[PDB]
Amino acid sequence: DNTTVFTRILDRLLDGYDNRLRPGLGERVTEVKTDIFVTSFGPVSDHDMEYTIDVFFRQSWKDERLKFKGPMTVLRLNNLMASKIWTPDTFFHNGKKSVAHNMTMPNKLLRITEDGTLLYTMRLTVRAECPMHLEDFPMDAHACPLKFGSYAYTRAEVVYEWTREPARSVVVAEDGSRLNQYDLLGQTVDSGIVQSSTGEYVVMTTHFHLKRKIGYFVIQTYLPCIMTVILSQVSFWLNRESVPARTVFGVTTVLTMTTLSISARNSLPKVAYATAMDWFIAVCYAFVFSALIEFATVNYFTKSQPARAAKIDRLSRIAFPLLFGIFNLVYWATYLNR
Amino acid sequence: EGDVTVILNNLLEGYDNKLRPDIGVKPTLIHTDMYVNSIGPVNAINMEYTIDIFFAQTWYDRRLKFNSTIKVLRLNSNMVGKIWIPDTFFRNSKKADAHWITTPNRMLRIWNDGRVLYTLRLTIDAECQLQLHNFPMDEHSCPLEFSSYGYPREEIVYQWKRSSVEVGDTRSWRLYQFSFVGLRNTTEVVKTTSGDYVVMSVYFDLSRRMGYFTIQTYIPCTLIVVLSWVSFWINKDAVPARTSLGITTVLTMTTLSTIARKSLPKVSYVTAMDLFVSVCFIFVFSALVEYGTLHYFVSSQPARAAKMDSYARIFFPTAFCLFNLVYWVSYLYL
């Protein structure tokens, strides 16, 4: 008859318990200590300006109404019980669509200590908003947040605090990173207050700092475009009497350049403003176009001013590579110092 | 035992949540508010836009007034199913959802005199038919309508509060191609098979940003048409050179023409972008056909073809410049 004690303890625990009222309704401002363990920093979708994150959200607080005395010090409770006591109604301010996992059973735990302290852990995937400034794409670093707090309880009723020093209260698993196009440099945590028409509310924020990887864009956009420009310029070392060769060469180079530009922009999401990749694309495309038109001028001035035709061929030969080299130096320096 | 517990237990005693306050006396008057967290992406393909709001409603329920020393009850989402709640719905929403993590995101506050405040967080995929003429130089202002589902004008009347609909930053919003310009709110009565209903509207003025489209479509197309112009300045005996140049410009133009409309629904009218791209393609076509005709006539009327070469040199750039001028002035005017 050693289980009757626990069943009676649990049955009495809720006797005369009102879960519409926060703990410490007439004594305190309820104080919830929060901790987040990021099991995996999910993928970041720059198309949707969002990122996914899977966390073990641990919230603790005190409930004098649930003090108990018995053989056990810490008491395990089930979802049917946790649904009958008051729990903080935390929500994610920038959350889009979060799922609480319930297979094979709800992924929640509720522990009570003899002194009335509760620990409520929940495993849940959060899809949160990641407002992205893609001006320096593909060299852009983002710091987009995870902000949570209470709905319906102002700072005069419920206040959140980090259970440990703030920097150590958000912990990312070593193998958590599920990112393939970004790199997680670290995070910063903070607290704050948000003013609404219904009062002031406590906000707990965490910024995860990301840095985009460049190797893919280099090896699949930048090098093909640079080499197409190089070809367009290679046109100049041929002879002027090879008119069909020069014309087909230039026109097919422009065709390849349009193909590359279409592919690159189709890769990037549809943002209506200019990114570093767009600047590179446009400048290289301008170089190809200018080489073709310069050849046209050389061909025109042939048969009528051969001296000037040769002079301009030599001048273009000398100048265009210098302009392209200077542009590359300036562009890469200005976008890598940042 | 506790004071507030007794107040709540007394309030809920003898309460029928199936009957609106004043079910047979006068219409329930509900004041409404909105705090727009964000306006998500506007996809013209499906003719919808996402919006995230905090939606608040206030009304008087004479059965919810108490006489304690406490002035206001501050509550969770636990009592929302216990008291009567208006059945407000969004008339033009393809799909909407409330938020449930970690706890239902509702709020309830009952005042001493029976006044009730109810707030919930919503995400709405509102529908609006975008007149896609002048695209990409198009402006839109499309609504969010809501009303009661079952209570006609004689039971429920909605009314906007002084400063009801408010927007937040507008800097972090996910409006890719558009730019929030302003909002307006309206009231109307709409007749239905069920009855007359007070319909409340909020309008959001969205202006497209050329940006993406202008760069990708307009500049490459213009330079491709200029390629045929430069072709004009080569020679008459350079037959393979001119023919290859014209055909490859045609191929490049055809490649370009497809991605212009990949950001558009399958609308069966002509947009500004489509007109521009088609005109450019016709310009390239006409340049190559002109060279073909000149090469044919080189054996018939050399004296006439000599005039024709320079005549084309003159006309083609001038015609394209006039087309640009008229096109841009007319569309930017609209």
């Epitope: 410490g24 309704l25 007439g26 004594e27 305190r28 401002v29 004098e64 102002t154 700072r155 005069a156 009723e157 206040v159 207050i193 003013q195 009062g199 002031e200 | 004071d3 507030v4 020393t69 406490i70 002035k71 206001v72 009850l73 501050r74």
Partner: T-cell receptor, first 109, second 116 residues
């Protein structure tokens, strides 16, 4: 922490005029600001609570407004007995309760 | 009808002790949070300590480093303040003030009534 500052430190006015007392807080105290009147030789009396609501039995000439960090108390048609010291009190987290230094409202002759 | 009556007046030598009591009548004593406010001679009002309406929770100002202790008895309808390790800076008129009940903080933020 929260520090309430009342300006002016004194306010010299004559009966029948319109007075304005300002209490400015270092950080936001939301709507939790109250105004008290202490006629010398007596205990304080509540005038305005929650920054806008008049207490029970207060003549309608006492009005208050504000929110956040800037609050104001306005007396219209100063009666002779409305000359006293006025305090602003705030309810917050870091200091539970706190009073302003007080504003002494005297007669102008 | 409401009546708060402070008592315990008396001289004290520095480092001494004193027990102020405030007898309340005319209202339900166990529903209101009560507080102690002191005014030094020629100075402004200053809040000393507050006790919940059930006596469970107590709050003290910064200047009282664990020296005072507030208490109440709902059976006697009385509010107490035991003072210890006093100082000459502690001279003042001490008021008991009652705070209305509310679901925010541990009562409305203000004092609805004051003692003499």
């Amino acid at each position: 922490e929260i520090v309430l500052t009342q300006s002016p430190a004194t306010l010299s006015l004559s009966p029948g005029e319109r007075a304005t007392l300002s209490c400015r807080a270092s950080q936001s105290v939301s709507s939790y600001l109250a105004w008290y009147q202490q006629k010398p030789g007596q205990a304080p009396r509540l005038l305005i609570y929650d920054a806008s609501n008049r207490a029970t039995g207060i003549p309608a000439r006492f009005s208050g407004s504000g929110s956040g960090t800037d609050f104001t108390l306005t007396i219209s048609s100063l009666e002779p007995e409305d000359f006293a010291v006025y305090y602003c009190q705030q309810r917050s987290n870091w200091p539970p309760y706190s009073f302003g230094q007080g504003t002494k409202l005297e007669i102008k002759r | 009808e409401v009546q708060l009556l402070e008592s315990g007046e008396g001289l004290v030598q520095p480092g001494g002790s004193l027990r102020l009591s405030c007898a309340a009548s005319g209202f339900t004593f166990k529903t209101y949070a009560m507080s102690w406010v002191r005014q030094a001679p020629g100075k402004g009002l200053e809040w000393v300590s507050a006790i919940s309406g059930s006596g469970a929770s107590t709050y003290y100002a910064d200047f009282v480093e664990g020296r005072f202790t507030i208490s109440r008895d709902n059976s006697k309808n009385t509010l107490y303040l035991q003072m210890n390790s006093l100082r000459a800076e502690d001279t003042a008129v001490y008021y008991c003030a009652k705070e209305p009940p509310a679901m925010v903080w541990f009562g409305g933020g203000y004092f609805d009534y004051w003692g003499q």
